Amino acid sequence: WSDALALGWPTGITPEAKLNRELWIGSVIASFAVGAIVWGLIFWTSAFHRKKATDTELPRQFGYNMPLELTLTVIPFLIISVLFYFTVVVQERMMHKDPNPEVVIDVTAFQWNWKFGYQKIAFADGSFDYDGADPERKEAMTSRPEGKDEHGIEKVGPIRGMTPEDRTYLNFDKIETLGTSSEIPVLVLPAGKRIEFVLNSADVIHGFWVPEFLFKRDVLPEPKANNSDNVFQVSEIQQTGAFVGRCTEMCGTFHAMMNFEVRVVEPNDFKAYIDQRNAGKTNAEALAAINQPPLAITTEPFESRRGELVPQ
Amino acid sequence: MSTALTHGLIGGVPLVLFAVLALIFLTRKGPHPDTYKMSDPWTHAPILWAAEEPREHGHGGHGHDSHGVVIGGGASGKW
Amino acid sequence: MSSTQDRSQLDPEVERHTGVDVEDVPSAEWGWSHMPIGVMHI
Amino acid sequence: MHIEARLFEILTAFFALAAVVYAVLTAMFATGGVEWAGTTALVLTTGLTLITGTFFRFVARRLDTRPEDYEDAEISDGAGELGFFAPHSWWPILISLSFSTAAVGAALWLPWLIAAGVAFVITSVCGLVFEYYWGPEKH
Amino acid sequence: ELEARRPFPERMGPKGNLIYKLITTTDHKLIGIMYCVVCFAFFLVGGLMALFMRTELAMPGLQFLSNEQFNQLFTMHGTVMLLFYATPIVFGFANLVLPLQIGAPDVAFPRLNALSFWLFLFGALIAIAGFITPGGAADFGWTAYSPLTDAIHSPGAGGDLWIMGLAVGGLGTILGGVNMITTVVCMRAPGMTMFRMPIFTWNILVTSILVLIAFPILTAALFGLAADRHLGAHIYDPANGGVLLWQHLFWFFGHPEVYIIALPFFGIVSEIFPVFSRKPIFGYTTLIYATLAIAALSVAVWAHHMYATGAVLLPFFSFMTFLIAVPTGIKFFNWIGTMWKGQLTFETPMLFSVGFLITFLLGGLSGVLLASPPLDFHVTDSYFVIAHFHYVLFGTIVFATYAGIYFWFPKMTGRLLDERLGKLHFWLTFIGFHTTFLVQHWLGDEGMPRRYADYLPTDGFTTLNVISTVGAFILGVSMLPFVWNVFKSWRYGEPVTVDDPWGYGNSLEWATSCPPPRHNFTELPRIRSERPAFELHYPHMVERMRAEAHVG
Amino acid sequence: MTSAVGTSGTAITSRVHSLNRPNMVSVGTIVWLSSELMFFAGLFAMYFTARAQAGGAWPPEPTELNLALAVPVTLVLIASSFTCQMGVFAAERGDVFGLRRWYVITFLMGLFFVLGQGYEYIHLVEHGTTIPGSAYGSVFYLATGFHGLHVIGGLVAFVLLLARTKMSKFTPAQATAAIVVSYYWHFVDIVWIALFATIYFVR
Amino acid sequence: ELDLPYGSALTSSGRISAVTEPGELSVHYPFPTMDLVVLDDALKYGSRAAKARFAVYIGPLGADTAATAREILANVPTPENAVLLAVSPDQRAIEVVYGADVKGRGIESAAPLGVSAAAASFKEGNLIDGLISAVRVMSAGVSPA
Ligand code: HEA
Ligand code: HEA
Ligand SMILES: CCCCCCCC/C=C\CCCCCCCC(=O)OC[C@H](COP(=O)(O)OCCN)OC(=O)CCCCCCCCCCCCCCC
Ligand SMILES: [Cu+2]
Ligand SMILES: [Cu+2]
Ligand SMILES: [Cu+2]
């Protein structure tokens, strides 16, 4: 009954997702109760037809019921305040910002596909002496001694002294699971660990949404400069297997072709995968080596052809 | 799924529903009074109809006065 | 009131008796005022 | 115009409260302090309502109760010379067309078309404004 | 002792009696008619864009549309339906009856409202004109987020025409707000106090303020975007707060935009219930306060459309989003109270008016679900949101506007729209609507972000999409009975030779000939209460309307 | 055409008798100015967001505001508002020519303000700062140049009203037209005061 | 003096503002809308040639039918050039009356033709069609003043 009453909400795979699903179930129950009573009122006042027995006498013509108005403007405030309190307590576990993530994934989303960096890994049980690279974060300070003019301008740069073509906000890592247009990226994560996602956009705003995480975030170009808390954490992922993930903000024309996967594997599988990726290998090769289907099993890199009626 | 089935569904379900609703509603007696049958007596109040065809001097009512009926003809018949 | 009512005698010459009427086109007598509907249809 | 002014006074009070609370709760408890977009927008919509309500209040204090604003007013009380309301005019469509020309000139970055559209807008606004003041031709 | 009336009223009129009025018309009644006709044309044009989206989305493949062609469709469909059908038609209805409903002969600046309509029409055309360009119309979404709208992304001319088309159309909306607000403040009947003018006129008044507060921000933002696109003005550069600046600027306009689209039709629905329930609008003084509260709150709860961005004071906007739902709840309960213990007769205006209640509520109930950020996270930017604001818009500005059209067609044409065709049109619309969008809640609840041109067959919810397409084509054919009804009822159809074709009318617009005389009146009754026309037509009720009032 | 069906001296008269009832044109123009305030609110929001995201040195190194020239123009605009109000006082009277003098010198001083703004613009442009050259330059130019466009529109309104006063007899309607034009000019100078305090003093 | 049974009130000026319950109509004429339109089209432009106002009176005309026809023709806006065809099916009677100005323009010669056209259709059983035919024939007969 819960699945049907959830209105097609996938059963979460994280503690945060489970808690959000429970809040959604409660809020939908409240909304359906309110809707049921209001629709009952409407379909019961629809029983007040103009009865032919109604002689030349108009209705009670009352209007203006102050006590009833007060009651029906007090109760909605109570309902929405209870819902707001539940919302706040659930929100509190939206980004706990635990300063000790078990694996940090640098999710950089460029125009029409994804890339995952594996910035850092630090298992609580003790493992994964791994770290991000960051030699490639090179700035584009246009601080030339002189510009077109002969002297004086000594232009530094448009924005904070730099150029919009900066890309310094982007972070890069040794293990990059770049997603090609013909190969859906598959970010592989260890099961049972705390996974942080550091979110960024190379070109334009778009949205990282794993539907089974019951949570999305908007990867913006420069979240730090836009006062956006791009980085967000997930306490745990219980269920293993492949979970589809999608782009949920306008990217451009190929906004519907940015699907990726978040394949949750066991911690030992993650050990093997990261070792085999440190060794020169691709994501598909590492998946095959850890004995898991290499290509995204929940989605395909569907046709680059503009459509069905195009003549190939 | 079943491209032909989906096309036929989207093209036909609206048509079937439209036909059903038209049969339900358009086939209902309208508020327009039924045509007066000659056999039945004339129950409606007297009806006088006029063309409004020509220009009536000035539009304003005042000044028209009552020159008179000045009847200038006649006729009769019994169907 | 700084205007004088105009009056004009326009030299007339079809007698606008089979075609358009002043009720439909107020200035039928003042110029070419009706094209046969056959012309528009064809 | 007491109620007319009071509407905007109430709106101004609410918008001032909203701007103040937004500014405070954004200067603290936000990622980067004051948002500076919502804050400014709220402050200047408070200013919108404040200007309109202040003018309406000035008018209400300057005016004796009108039949419109007076409960228990007979129609004959307000009966009289209503002011000039513009009859038929074809200048509005010309103004709209001129502004559309300027707008397409801005969209398609055509400075010549922008200049032409601005000149047409000036001409059409002049026509609309002078429509009921142009005197008879002097010959 | 008998009158010489024509056997039937004049059907159309003499050749060349209308074309020159349209060009020169300074009559609000005719301008309102121009709004309604033109606005509906954009509804049909904008609605047709959804049928192409529906047909494409019925199957996982890209059968006949391209990724960018589909992207242009929801941009222009969302744009046309909101800014070229929904926002211009509130001033279409305002121009239609607002001077009538306050006893005024005309609007405050009647050459200005003529300009507003033409600014709407021509501004709308240049926005839709992005289609004729080879690149296409504006590909970015209707919201038109910042970096995607920069010259770097979406460099085509269609995107620019869209920006300027809104600027031109926006000005007409701003000027229209000046007329309605100035008309109400200044031009009023000798007895119509501010607390006795009808609810619709009050709703338009507060809506006009929202228009003045909101639209200028859009024009400022659009010029900033246009400056960025044409001059590289770094106004919305992401390194600045550009991405969150535009969203803050746009939604500060955006959310009031979805309420100027809502409040006027709350008045229309509020105008129709008392006349057909045969009793006063339940809680008149409460509705005007509810309307005033909604407009005050709508300005300061703009950012609840930006929960996913993770860059806004999340608790603040959620609280006021829950606070702005309460006034709309009061308004909803009052409408039921008006229907309560009333001699309801479900003519085509009530039928649509009641339909608004049913559709709006479910859309409203989902609205608070979106007001919760934790729920808004998963469900944001998905078809659940598409289903939310369609149950609310379509409920509020299709069901209610049709109720307004059906309610006020005699009062502007002198002819009655056929009841049977109206009932057919409603149930086609009601059955069609609930079909297309009800499943879209489930569609988006499971992973399916909106603005998706294609989806995989392996992805589920393929059956829901076809069900949605079936509903939209039921909606597609539902506009045929309406257009036929209006087409054959404007020139033919049962004439009304009396005021109030719907007896028990209020608001003083039913105190004049159904086709109102130029300058709206030959007879202004003694205005005493919120129901002048009812007081006039039923003097015996005058005492009762005061006696039974207080009990509630 | 005996004398007239409408016993009015002027074919154009006030929209409602202003002595007892609100001046409708004044109400409309005040509301529209309240809207233009929100337009400038959007511009101010852009400027303040750029200022917030600036890394300490809000006006970049290349840009240097010429307050020595920005203060004279601001004082000239204030004087323009004062003389416009004097013109309004003439308008309330039948002083057609007093109104014309006051509004002509108002237009001249507003034109001087526009020319001074253009001078500062070209000076800043040749000294690096330009709309595409910097975020500061772009927000500053956007705000100040939209205000400059509003000032140009005000000058156009002034000359247009003067032309209208030249073609028909002075009446309460035309005095009201002058009053609303003055309302626009006062709004323009007030938004200029806000922009000056924001750009040059607050910085 | 009494207004309509319900909902109609005399206004500040002479005009009476009436109302009807939402379901029903106002004209209540017992003829199809389309043939009402046809008869209106006849009266309107099939008579423009005559330049004399053509009027139709379906109501009863009792007592001396001719005289009642005269004093109902009196109600036509300009009886001077007017042609009133009155049919009473309560009496199966037809009476056509003419104004002084509409005399000698073929109106007198068209009276038997119009009456016969009305009578044939009426005995066939079509009141509105007979009225239309009579109007057409009479208007063809009359010549502009
Ligand atoms: C007429 C148009 C209209 C109306 C009235 C509303 C009304 C409301 N909207 Fe609406 N909204 C839109 C049009 C509208 N909205 C549009 C067009 C979008 C764009 C989508 C996008 O771009 O994101 C949007 C987006 C939108 C979002 C963003 C969704 C997202 O992007 O993820 C959210 C919340 O997050 C929201 C909330 C609300 C709320 C809480 C109300 C409420 O104020 C009113 C409705 C709710 C009710 C509950 C009314 C019924 C109340 C009662 C019956 C009283 C008793 C019941 C209770 C107390 C629950 N709206
Ligand atoms: C007033 C506002 C309004 C209205 C009435 C509608 C009406 C409809 N909308 Fe609306 N819709 C929006 C506003 C509106 N929408 C907005 C604001 C968005 C978000 C856009 C964005 O995020 O960018 C949206 C998004 C949206 C989407 C998501 C697009 C995507 O993200 O991929 C879909 C998908 O099916 C959709 C479908 C529909 C349907 C089926 C209707 C139907 O109810 C429409 C009825 C159809 C018709 C009336 C056409 C039938 C008529 C004819 C076929 C005759 C044609 C004749 C001529 C052209 C002369 N809408
Ligand atoms: C909507 C308009 C379009 C979009 C919105 C624009 C709003 C701007 C408003 C006012 C700005 C005025 C001040 C502008 C001057 C300030 C100095 C400057 O801009 O810097 C020099 C740069 C070159 O820089 P460069 O190549 O790098 O070379 C450096 C050399 N070393 O010139 C420029 O591009 C500036 C040219 C901009 C002209 C804008 C004209 C607007 C008129 C539009 C008419 C109304 C349209 C109605 C629309 C419905
Ligand atoms: Cu995406
Ligand atoms: Cu993307
Ligand atoms: Cu909102």
Author numbering:
A (entry chain K): 27 to 338
B (entry chain a): 1 to 79
C (entry chain J): 1 to 13, 22 to 50
D (entry chain Z): 1 to 139
E (entry chain L): 10 to 561
F (entry chain X): 1 to 203
G (entry chain b): 13 to 157
Task: Copy the relevant paper text.
Telacebec inhibits the mycobacterial respiratory supercomplex composed of complexes III and IV (CIII2CIV2). In mycobacterial electron transport chains, CIII2CIV2 replaces canonical CIII and CIV, transferring electrons from the intermediate carrier menaquinol to the final acceptor, molecular oxygen, while simultaneously transferring protons across the inner membrane to power ATP synthesis. Structural analysis of the CIII2CIV2 supercomplex from M. smegmatis led to the discovery that a dimeric type C superoxide dismutase (SOD) is an integral component of the assembly. Each CIII contains two sites where redox reactions with MQ occur: a QP site near the positive (periplasmic) side of the membrane where MQH2 is oxidized and a QN site near the negative (cytoplasmic) side of the membrane where MQ is reduced.
CryoEM of the CIII2CIV2 preparation allowed for calculation of a 3D map of the enzyme at a nominal resolution of 3.0 Å. The map shows strong density for the LpqE subunit (orange). The overall resolution of the map, which is somewhat better than in previous studies, allowed refinement of an atomic model for CIII2CIV2 including residues T82, E83, A123 to D131, and S183 from LpqE, and residues H57 to G78 from MSMEG_4693 (also known as CtaJ), which could not be modeled previously. In the present map, the overall shape of SOD, although still at lower density than the rest of the complex, was more readily apparent (pink). The N-terminal anchors from the SOD dimer that bind to subunit QcrB are well resolved and terminate at the middle of the complex with a lipid anchor (beige). In the inhibitor-free structure there is density for endogenous MQ in the QP site (pale blue surface). The naphthoquinone head group of MQ is positioned near the entrance to the site, between the F and C helices. In this position, the naphthoquinone head group is ~14 Å away from the FeS cluster and the hydroxyl proton is ~15 Å from His368, which is too far for rapid coupled electron and proton transfer from MQH2 to FeS and His368, respectively. Although the endogenous MQ found in the structure is most likely oxidized, the position it occupies is along the access path to the FeS center. We speculate that reduced MQH2 also adopts the same position, at least transiently, during turnover. This binding site within QP is denoted the Q1b position.
